[PDB]
Write a protein that binds this ligand. Structure first.
Ligand SMILES: [Hg+2]
Ligand SMILES: [Hg+2]
Ligand SMILES: [Hg+2]
Ligand SMILES: [Hg+2]
Lengths: 527, 527
């Protein structure tokens, strides 16, 4: 009955939320997995036992335990990303914004949030799909998943805490969407999973994982790709970090079971407090507990898969933002400050390069510095600042994405690549950070539409263009209904996603990414 | 008596050569060392036993045995550099163009010819100092020296054929100039030695060698510097090449003496025919018998010297030409042809890089390719062509020169650096080669002055500017009498040497040379 929907899991009483000039069905907080609390901490998610009686889906679910970000208290730019509901381990709940009148079967769009796998909320304001579902007649469901140790602690040997558990949560979220989205008016065979940062990497880790390939149709990866430095760790590394976290919380590391038992006893916060104490190297854009390459979720090294074309062949719309690294420097690189032009000195530029490329040996750092240094002005504060904004940007998000796009394109059924180079006129972050990683979302989610958030009309336009590109793609598999070029390994066309007339370019940051994806690693292996 | 001059070596009857609108004293072919013929082949030069009776110095001396260049028979561009007099081992003779009326004591300018140590004639047309001596009132003497095996065979152990012998010939030429130039009206304490290519490298190898530091005042190094890849070889390498040449001419290599005896029996040509068969690697801009780092002429590695400031501190005016490598590619790199735009294909670009950096391992070549490849047009024939014109240019002449200039400047009494970027309007070589290595000489030697060689008036101007820069520098030690900036490690100013208003630039090909002089070798050592 419009708001009340019956599903295989049970009847769910949604709510009618106002959107733009109208209203929309919104089913918030539908469980999709049994609360991963208790002795299930780290353990894979069990499906949600069918409930009875309408499940009140009118209020946003809790947010998984995650590292809040107090780096700029009350500062929107940072707070807008912090869990905005009571954190709880009992957070595995999905949200569904369904057009009104409820479609009979329309495109479904599942959103997987970002936050380098250590943070993330499906309830964030910029993730409110009410405008996307409405403006684009699409059924948008944003899932949630265990982030941090809680969902990614990878003591490989054990089953009590195998890795990628939080990656499984997404699969469970996707499975439920597959089985019940029809009851919401969603076409289960036209489910496009989109995500940014870690989400754009998770989405991609589903295109690879055999287990997930069937639970969705297409994929939109924003500022992310599974093959990212920060997005994965070997089973061993994850084990290491698992015992290290254990060490930090002072656990009996004599065995996976004793360790796990110990960890299962620590309050959520005990883990979140010391969870950064386990990175193996002083760095930037690196997170502790991140998807482990287990051989179960991921059959082999994402590169071996990407190489052998061992992945779901479909059409993917992926892209990156002009300034991917700015946010990570400003937070973990010296010399950058929210309130200053952050004109990084040379002595600090090299401190930047150390943090950006934590694996690089001296020669590595040397090669990186050689590529990013002006040499005809090797002291320019600005040049050094922007240089790092690229070392971190290219190295962490652009280059691995250009790899995945290229390796995937030689097998997938179409690739559409964009380059979002637009600093939201109403941004609150420093102008130097430029087009920040994670700031295209508010556009993808049609925020410019709401006048209260006051974006220039020109941006509302961009928003609608972006949302249509997304929606039209989720439906047809092509962003087009001028023409957004297909990405082909031969020509490598991609487009700028800004308020200016959508221009076409070729070979995103090619000179750099060749060094990043071809030379640097080759150097590092030799030296 | 004007033309007849008496010297410590003996009376020398010169000749009066016409120059421009006037005439000039010219003493051609004055011996400065005993003919290195007979059993003195390879042996150091003995000074010239004082003769008696006027030595007729009215006709150019013979040219040392050298590899003629038949690569373009009759083609000026190539022939202009081939020995233009009967080659003979008896070639150690200097030439002196003395102003008229003979000065009482004026600046002396000794010229050391180029030709990668395997070729060279002091009698070449573009080396005719009649215009320089005349226009600049300077006493210009161009010496000659044993080139190729004949002067550089370095069987270190032996004394019968120690290396740098031809480098000693230059010293003997310089010694005589020191002892007798006064009789010609030359100021022996104001002798500036200038040279190009190997000459510009020899000049520099005198600024280093303790034995020579006292025989001259200043140095002008054109497209050369002692620290060049091709300009020196370890005593061992020279030994190797010495036995290899020996092998090629089928000699008893059982001992330096038997080898040397054998080599001393081969006609000059036997050596010149197989002398290229000894390079250790298929390459470009590399010559067989070149100055060996003996520990006698060169106390230590030119780098250790350059580092420790172990060199003659004076003012040096040095520079490079825009397209240093063009000539070497066109001759030894595939895809280049005198008669075609030589739009090198990619498959050949990498063949170029192999030849240019013969020492580089795969990673080396990779790093080189990374720096010189467009990556946004990695197939452009032109871009690939010019790219090599730089790999060869920078790697072989610009970068080592930027090293020497920088390392020397931190101890010398003034450095003036130029960048000759001017394609002689009357050049006969392909336009693609651009400003060719060795084509600034005809300017330095005032050739544009003679209308018969027809250069645009604008170039005659440039010629006179260049010759004055040279002369004024030889006299005062400053090229200036707008201001040609001093080269300082802090700012690194240098000037363009073209027909356009002399502009000032800073840090010649810095991005590249940092890779060449700092990264590449560091990479190569690690890998
Ligand atoms: Hg990624
Ligand atoms: Hg639309
Ligand atoms: Hg040189
Ligand atoms: Hg002059």
């Amino acid at each position: 009955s419009e708001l009340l929907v019956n599903t295989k899991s049970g009847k769910v009483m949604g709510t009618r939320v106002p959107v733009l000039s109208s209203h929309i069905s919104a089913f918030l907080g539908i469980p999709f997995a049994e609360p991963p609390v208790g002795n299930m901490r780290f353990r894979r998610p069990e499906p949600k036992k069918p409930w009875s009686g309408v499940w009140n889906a009118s209020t946003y679910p809790n947010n998984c335990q995650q590292y809040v970000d107090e780096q700029f208290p009350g500062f929107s730019g940072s707070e807008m990303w912090n869990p905005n509901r009571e954190m709880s381990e009992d957070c595995l709940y999905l949200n569904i914004w369904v057009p009104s009148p409820r479609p009979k079967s329309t495109t479904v769009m599942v959103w997987i949030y970002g936050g380098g796998f250590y943070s993330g909320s499906s309830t964030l304001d910029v993730y409110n799909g009410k405008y996307l579902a409405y403006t684009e007649e699409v059924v948008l469901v944003s899932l949630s998943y265990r982030v941090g140790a809680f969902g990614f602690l990878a003591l490989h040997g054990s089953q009590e805490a195998p890795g990628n558990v939080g990656l499984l949560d997404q699969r469970m979220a996707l499975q439920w969407v597959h089985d019940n989205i029809q009851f919401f008016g969603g076409d289960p065979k036209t489910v496009t999973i989109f995500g940014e940062s870690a989400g754009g990497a998770s989405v991609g880790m589903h295109i690879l994982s055999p287990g997930s390939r069937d639970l969705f149709r297409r994929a939109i990866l924003q500022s992310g790709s599974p093959n990212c430095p920060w997005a994965s760790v070997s089973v061993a590394e994850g084990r290491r970090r698992a015992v290290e976290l254990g060490r930090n919380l002072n656990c009996n590391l004599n065995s996976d079971e004793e360790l796990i038992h110990c960890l299962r006893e620590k309050k959520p916060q005990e883990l979140i407090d010391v969870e950064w104490n386990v990175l193996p190297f002083d760095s930037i854009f690196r997170f502790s507990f991140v998807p482990v390459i287990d051989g179960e979720f991921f059959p082999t090294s994402l590169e071996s898969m990407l190489n052998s074309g061992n992945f779901k062949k479909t059409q993917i719309l992926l892209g990156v933002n002009k300034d991917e690294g700015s946010f990570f420097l400003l937070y973990g690189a010296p010399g950058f400050s929210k309130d200053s032009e952050s004109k990084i000195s040379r002595e600090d530029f090299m401190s930047g390069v150390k943090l950006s490329v934590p694996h690089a040996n001296d020669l590595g750092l040397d090669a990186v510095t050689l590529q990013y240094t002006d040499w005809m002005d090797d002291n320019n504060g600005i040049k050094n600042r922007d240089g790092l904004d690229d070392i971190v940007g290219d190295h962490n998000v652009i280059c691995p994405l250009m790899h995945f796009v290229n390796k995937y394109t030689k097998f997938g059924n179409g690739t559409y690549l964009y380059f979002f180079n637009h600093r939201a006129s109403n941004l609150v972050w420093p102008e130097w950070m430029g087009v920040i990683h994670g700031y295209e979302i508010e556009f993808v989610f049609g925020l410019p539409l709401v006048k209260e958030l006051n974006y220039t009309a020109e941006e509302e336009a961009l928003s609608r263009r972006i949302m249509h590109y997304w929606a039209t793609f989720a439906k047809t598999g092509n962003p087009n209904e001028s023409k957004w070029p297909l990405f082909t390994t031969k020509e490598q066309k991609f487009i700028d996603l800004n308020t200016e007339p959508m221009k076409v370019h070729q070979r995103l940051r090619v000179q750099m990414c060749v060094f990043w994806n071809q030379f640097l690693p080759k150097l590092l292996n030799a030296t």
